Amino acid sequence: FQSMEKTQETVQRILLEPYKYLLQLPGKQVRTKLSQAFNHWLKVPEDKLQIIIEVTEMLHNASLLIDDIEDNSKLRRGFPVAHSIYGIPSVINSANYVYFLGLEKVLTLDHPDAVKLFTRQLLELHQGQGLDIYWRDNYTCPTEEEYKAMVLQKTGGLFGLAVGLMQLFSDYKEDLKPLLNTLGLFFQIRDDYANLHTEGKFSFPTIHAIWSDVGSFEYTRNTLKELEAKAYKQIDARGGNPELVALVKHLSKM
Amino acid sequence: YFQSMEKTQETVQRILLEPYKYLLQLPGKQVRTKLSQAFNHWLKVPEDKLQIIIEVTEMLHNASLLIDDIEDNSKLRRGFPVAHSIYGIPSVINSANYVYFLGLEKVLTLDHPDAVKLFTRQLLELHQGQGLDIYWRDNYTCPTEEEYKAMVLQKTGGLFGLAVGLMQLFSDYKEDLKPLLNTLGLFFQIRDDYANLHSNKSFCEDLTEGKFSFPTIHAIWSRILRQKDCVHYLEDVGSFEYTRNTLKELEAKAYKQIDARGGNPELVALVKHLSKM
Ligand SMILES: O=C(Nc1cccc(-c2nc(NC(P(=O)(O)O)P(=O)(O)O)c3ccsc3n2)c1)c1ccc(F)cc1
């Protein structure tokens, strides 16, 4: 009656706490820098942007809560992972609810293909997470070619959501999927290299070593620069973009 | 020959659905189907749209049990080990979540905009059900009978309303079944609770399988702060006696609300059959 509507509204506050626990962790205020850069082509409406951002950022973190459980991570960016605090069921709930609150949010774009797209990209992400666990469960390191596959499914899976949602809400229609893989790998491999120089996570240098001390760092350096090159050569054939290339050349520090 | 991505891909689908399949093969998925067919005697929906509404409902159900078992730390389900104790927590979470989104994809094929609206609400609801369940658990508290019923209509007992609601989108039938659907949702659940018990020299949180069950709750509220040989204790409290009473009492209101919607032979057959327990 009365008491049930209080006890219910409460549960929704509670439900977001693991999601919030992940928001507050250090860095990943730099995601925002990136989508803003992409808007120098898409010229998207400020109000559709804020929702595409809200969504992307919801799906991301909900997807990390699961990824940590699934990877049996112990820490994330140095702090304990969400499940070791709130506990697995409490987390599963929060991520899943947040994913669906993000559906609800995409519905507000009022665009039938946006749900179509969200659904595809999530389905993709789950297959990535799929493989990741498959390998883990079978005590197996994936090959370099397979590692990249998983990243484009998981990472290009959720770059591609955002850039693709925005491109729905733009008269810009030239092909960024090419550029987005080049960035997806770039970002990942970099964050792998940085992180080393794992937490139950397959990482580009460890994989290259394992498929012969080794100087995978030497190879990873080489492999990273080589993408950045293809970043610029595909950035240009899309009429160029100052904001983005600033954020690339900045990041090529590591 | 980069048939390597074609293999690596076909594989992932097989893998991803294995825990979902593991749950299908446990007994009698033919009884959900029996029910929605009965409801079509009012909605007169197209056979092909029905099949999808059914596929969806049935996907959401099982995916929702895979999670329920993890979350309730169940050990067994319908006698066999639970899905996660075989395939393992991460592998299961993945499969349920993927299945939920394959059900989105499926609802999209109904090609009617309100269907996504509805699915999204029902899922969000389901999660709040799971919400409550753990709220109570975390607070070391047994919920009231009143509250238990609320949780059931929110959660997996809820999932009739998705289907009947999807169907009613595709129908010029517009009279109110939500009333009848609670009466049925509780009926179905409480029955499956009673059955599950009447099925050792076991303890209760063994038999319930770490689950809130109508008879155990009624017992616990009879002999501001916080609430051997089970079966005979429950009969010594006679929750079984009360559950019998409480079940029949709904079935009665099933019939009295079935009728004020112009009556329905198919359904009433399936009720009176099921009233066996
Ligand atoms: O891993 C994904 N994206 C991606 C790509 C490049 C870097 C990162 C990333 N990676 C992180 N560290 C590592 P992890 O995800 O194991 O914490 P990763 O490099 O192996 O993904 C962290 C940690 C705190 S914020 C963060 N962001 C994530 C990812 C996760 C969930 C999705 F739904 C989609 C992509």
Chain A residues close to B101, C-beta within 8 Å: 119, 122-123, 126
B101 and chain A in contact, CB less than 8 A:
yes
Mind telling me how many Å the CA of B149 is from chain A's nearest CA? Answer: 11
B144 and chain A in contact, CB less than 8 A:
no
A148 is in an annotated binding site: no
Atom of ligand 1 nearest to the CA of A76: 17
Number of domains in chain B: 1
Q: Where are the beta strands (DSSP E) in A14-145?
A: 75-76, 79-80
Residue type, B55: E
Interface test with A, best of B65, B101, B147, B154 (most A CBs within 10 A): B101
First-residue to last-residue Cα distance in chain B = 60
The Cα A113–Cα A135 span in angstroms is 33
CATH code: domain of residue B126: 1.10.600.10
A34 and chain B in contact, CB less than 8 A:
no
The Cα A209–Cα A35 span in angstroms is 34
Q: Which of A160, A170, A91 is nearest to A122 (CA)?
A: A160
Report the structure determination method: X-ray
DSSP-derived letter for residue B109 is T
**Beta-ladder partners of A76:** A79
The Cα B127–Cα B266 span in angstroms is 32
Chain A residues close to B90, C-beta within 8 Å: 69-72, 133, 136-137
**Beta-ladder partners of B77:** B80
Atom of ligand 1 nearest to the CA of A158: 34
C-beta neighbour count of B12 within 10 angstroms:
18
The HSE-up count of residue A250 (CA atoms within 13 Å, CB side) is 9
C-beta neighbour count of A226 within 10 angstroms:
11
Domain enclosing residue A217, as ranges: 1-254
The HSE-up count of residue A239 (CA atoms within 13 Å, CB side) is 8
Q: H or E stretch including B77?
A: strand B76-77
The alpha carbon of residue A147 and the mean position of all alpha carbons in its chain are separated, in whole angstroms, by 15
The Cα B148–Cα B213 span in angstroms is 8
A12 and chain B in contact, CB less than 8 A:
yes
The Cα A78–Cα A90 span in angstroms is 21
Chain B residues close to A145, C-beta within 8 Å: 4
DSSP-derived letter for residue A81 is P
Residues in chain A, total:
254
Sequence-separated (6 or more) residues with CB below 8 Å from residue B131: A11, A12, A14, A15, A93, A97
Q: Tokens at residue A120, please?
A: 């595809």
Q: Which of A93, A96, A127, A109 is nearest to A53 (CA)?
A: A109
- Helices A46-71 & A112-137, crossing angle to 10 degrees? 20
The alpha carbon of residue A45 and the mean position of all alpha carbons in its chain are separated, in whole angstroms, by 23
CB contact under 8 A, B94 and A119: no
Q: H or E stretch including A238?
A: none
The Cα A57–Cα A23 span in angstroms is 9
B17 and chain A in contact, CB less than 8 A:
no
The Cα A59–Cα B216 span in angstroms is 39
Pocket of ligand 1 (CB under 6 A): A 28, 59-60, 63-64, 67, 76-77, 125, 154-155, 157-158, 187-188, 191-192, 201
DSSP-derived letter for residue A73 is -
CB contact under 8 A, A107 and B116: yes
The Cα A30–Cα B121 span in angstroms is 32
DSSP-derived letter for residue B80 is E
B77 φψ region: left (φ > 0), alpha (ψ -120 to 50), beta (else): beta
Chain A to chain B, count of Cβ pairs less than 8 Å apart? 118
In this structure, which residue's CA is closest to atom 1 in ligand 1? A155
Q: Which of A68, A73, A61, A67 is nearest to A21 (CA)?
A: A61
Residue written as token pair 């498959």: A134
A137 and chain B in contact, CB less than 8 A:
yes
Q: H or E stretch including B59?
A: helix B47-71
Q: Tokens at residue A147, please?
A: 């590692």
Three-state secondary structure call for residue A202: coil
The Cα A144–Cα A137 span in angstroms is 18
The Cα B36–Cα A76 span in angstroms is 46
- The minimal CB distance from A15 to the residues B15, B120, B131 is found for B131
Sequence-separated (6 or more) residues with CB below 8 Å from residue A31: A56, A57, A60
Q: Which of A9, A93, A7, A90 is nearest to B146 (CA)?
A: A7
Q: Evaluate the CA torsion angle A106, A245, A177, A240 in order and state its sign.
A: positive
In this structure, which residue's CA is closest to atom 27 in ligand 1? A28
The Cα A68–Cα A84 span in angstroms is 10
